Write a protein that binds this ligand. Sequence first.
Ligand SMILES: COc1cccc(/C=C2/SC(=N)NC2=O)c1OC
Ligand SMILES: COc1cccc(/C=C2/SC(=N)NC2=O)c1OC
Ligand SMILES: COc1cccc(/C=C2/SC(=N)NC2=O)c1OC
Ligand SMILES: COc1cccc(/C=C2/SC(=N)NC2=O)c1OC
Ligand SMILES: COc1cccc(/C=C2/SC(=N)NC2=O)c1OC
Ligand SMILES: COc1cccc(/C=C2/SC(=N)NC2=O)c1OC
Lengths: 331, 331, 331
Amino acid sequence: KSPVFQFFDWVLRGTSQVMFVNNPLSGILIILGLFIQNPWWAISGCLGTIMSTLTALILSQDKSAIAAGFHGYNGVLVGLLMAVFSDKGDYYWWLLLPVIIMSMSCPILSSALGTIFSKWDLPVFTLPFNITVTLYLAATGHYNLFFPTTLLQPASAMPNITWSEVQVPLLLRAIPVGIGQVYGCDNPWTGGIFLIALFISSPLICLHAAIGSTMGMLAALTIATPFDSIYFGLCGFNSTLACIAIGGMFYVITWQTHLLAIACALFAAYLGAALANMLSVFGLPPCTWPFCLSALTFLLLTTNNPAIYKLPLSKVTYPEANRIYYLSQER
Amino acid sequence: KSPVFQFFDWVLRGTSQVMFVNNPLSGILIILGLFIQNPWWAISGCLGTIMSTLTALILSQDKSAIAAGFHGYNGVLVGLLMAVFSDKGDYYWWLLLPVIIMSMSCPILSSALGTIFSKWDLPVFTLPFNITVTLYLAATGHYNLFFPTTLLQPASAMPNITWSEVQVPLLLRAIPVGIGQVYGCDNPWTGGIFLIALFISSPLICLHAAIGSTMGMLAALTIATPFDSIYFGLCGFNSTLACIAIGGMFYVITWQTHLLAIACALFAAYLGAALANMLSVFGLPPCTWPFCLSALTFLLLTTNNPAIYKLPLSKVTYPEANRIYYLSQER
Amino acid sequence: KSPVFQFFDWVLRGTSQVMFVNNPLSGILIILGLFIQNPWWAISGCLGTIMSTLTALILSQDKSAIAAGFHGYNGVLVGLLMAVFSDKGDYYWWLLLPVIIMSMSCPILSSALGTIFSKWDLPVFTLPFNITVTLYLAATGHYNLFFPTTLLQPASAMPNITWSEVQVPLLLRAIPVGIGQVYGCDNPWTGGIFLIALFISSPLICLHAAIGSTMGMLAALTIATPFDSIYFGLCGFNSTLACIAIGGMFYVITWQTHLLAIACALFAAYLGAALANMLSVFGLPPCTWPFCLSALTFLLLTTNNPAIYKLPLSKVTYPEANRIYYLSQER
Ligand SMILES: COc1cccc(/C=C2/SC(=N)NC2=O)c1OC
Ligand SMILES: COc1cccc(/C=C2/SC(=N)NC2=O)c1OC
Ligand SMILES: COc1cccc(/C=C2/SC(=N)NC2=O)c1OC
Ligand SMILES: COc1cccc(/C=C2/SC(=N)NC2=O)c1OC
Ligand SMILES: COc1cccc(/C=C2/SC(=N)NC2=O)c1OC
Ligand SMILES: COc1cccc(/C=C2/SC(=N)NC2=O)c1OC
């Protein structure tokens, strides 16, 4: 095996580890979906992942958690969110420069947070992306002269929501859109590609992703969010990530854990609305902060009943194998 | 004993554990005070506590720390602050719905923060309420269409404070008002009810509450806060909570700890002014964040002199019994 | 030795420990530089340090880490930043009052954060100053009536940067200015005094300070910061502090650690721009938050290669002695 082939296998695993799925075929499907959405964003995300995992190599990280894509998944998101929020337009080639620098900052953060979380056997999640992208989008802002960003400002008037005009078909379509919005992509076709890409590896992740996107869609219909965000998918990427993380991966899948995951989707969606109203004061977007906060507060949660079992971090692979491992360890 | 009677004993203990006091008679007195202030807020707070402790049951928490009200005290505050900040008015029955949902989110947080703080033998304090109420009041905001909230905006002009017009009698009355404002209630009569309710169980908690409210009242007269907030009690609920927590409960009461508690009241009041000027940018209120921050930074504080002694968390009950325990353990 | 002489030796060590340098001669040189800049700020800073270390005495802290100035360095910064941001002008004597109170709050915080960081063998850094000065500048604000502060507001229009008019000599002079801006002083002469004061004790700290100030100067020329801040030194005090902390002090100096320090200067400068655009919403300045955050995330960072070695906290003195200790321990 040529080492360059091994490295590209690593980057493909990284580009799908965002969905907690470690499978290069799902990675290539997700890359295809990104290119379907907008080739510029796909190029930016691939550059972000390449530089992130390369920096992980240079810093001489643990070689075990790079063949799992553990250091690339924070790069694809940095690239995609850097290039979806740039006001200069498409193929503004200069944007590739900070996308490099910030991509070199994901392993560092991913290391540091790890040492903070090691005391509680808790995963670093998508916090490294949040810190880096918040750093960039606040460092530059909308009025910057080299890398301006799209303007986000707090609501200043009561939204005009008419429940006569709700389109249920579009509202339903908010499920695959919510799945795809994790990567920044809103096209329903890329959402379908993502759902298929998850379903190839493990059905439970796909099921919990669909349930999470739906659950967030519903949670933002209770606090009367404007319908444009519902159709566009902005209210269903924190929810889906939280649902996947809590449902069957970090907890052995069980009906108790299933209800816990749905509750986590609720908490994550409401926290997403909160942080979106708060972080829009600075002009920042809610870039996968709510998922991180809700998943952390749902994994640190302590219970008595034996059904709610938190797998040791090393053992995690995917929900089916997690359940198989737990059943084996019971014997 | 009928189990329903036991559960209502639990909820009464929870409705008074806000004042660090574990006594069902004080709970019933505080409930009476709430109903004296505004029956709508009392109903909302009782619903919040009921659902919070019920969720603690469902999550199968430690049955020991529910007969102490440990999971209800974060529900009464959520209900009261949800229903004091609702712009729709009194008896807007729909408000009971989110008050349920958020009340089901207090045990979860109270568990999670516990696992974060267990490494330092530090109590979770009122942080669960802060997170939940901040989440709600930022998720909805003042312009929301289903559950609007009262508008809070940063100061935009120099306040007009005339020291000729200070009314000392009202200013003095800011002490019981400051005691009552912990629950959101500002009527002086409910403040008196609260002071009596504390004094029934343990005099030291009442004394430190009065001292803390006074100390915050004074601390906000040094930075020239507008007098309306002073009379209304907004500058004396963080201070009183901090003074109670540091004075005789988590530290064995001693004159050294007494000065430490007064200093903590000072730090908490100034931090309250700071967070109120900062958190008002988003439209959020300073909902018992300053007390939490100051009490944490005063309990993590490390000293050499043997007088400043931090009780192990399990042993805490109330200041007099704390002192008795320390004297016994000295022998 | 008269005890008052010992105490003034302590305060002189504290006034230079800001630059991670423990040498009373450097302390007296830095005091001289402060008096060269503006005598009012020097008086305020000396009062801050005196009261901070005095409070550390009263709280009966560890007598070992007061002859190193460990409790005074958070007081000089509180005084200097309190008195550089006061809108009332120079020799507004009333300002000395809160400068006392807040100076009595630095040991407390410095203790508390220590107990938080002890689990990770990480230094408390300049976080105590940040918390206290942010608390003050948000508690009072620009519209306060007793202690108003200078107005800081977010950018509302695209800056007009012309690269024809860049003055390279001034731009180069931004290096000593960046060194001096740690203490709030911008005069190039006080920057030179500071560079000399560092170079007296250990050349590596001076070298890393110059490199850090330069590296931040460059990092803020990439995101197109207005040139006034570049000349004035606002973009080079987080960078220099981070470079000193990571370069040779907390890591045994090596070329690997040198590149790590330069990368930390980059991350700290970009984070400084970010926090300055964010914290200016409240009206707060970026008071040595970026350095703290970047240095923490660069010390918690975990590597495999043996060159990147993190000294146990107790052993740290200065980079040359650190390297000598590491070489001795290798044998
Ligand atoms: C063997 O190490 C591991 C195996 C599997 C998942 C994780 C944690 C996360 S969290 C996230 N958003 N992506 C991941 O990979 C992990 O790190 C502890
Ligand atoms: C104008 O509104 C927007 C435009 C574009 C992205 C977002 C939010 C996110 S966050 C994330 N991880 N992916 C997205 O698309 C948004 O919501 C603020
Ligand atoms: C036996 O367990 C306990 C007994 C007593 C007080 C506490 C802590 C707190 S903090 C607060 N605001 N309310 C409480 O009850 C506790 O939890 C550790
Ligand atoms: C318009 O000003 C206000 C109106 C109502 C409540 C508050 C603050 C609090 S915080 C708390 N735990 N109880 C209260 O009453 C306030 O201050 C911002
Ligand atoms: C022996 O104890 C020590 C000796 C030397 C440096 C430190 C840490 C810091 S961090 C900072 N900004 N100033 C300091 O002194 C320390 O505390 C752990
Ligand atoms: C109007 O702009 C400013 C005026 C004055 C100080 C600063 C920032 C800092 S932060 C620090 N530790 N020393 C300084 O000088 C600033 O930048 C916001």
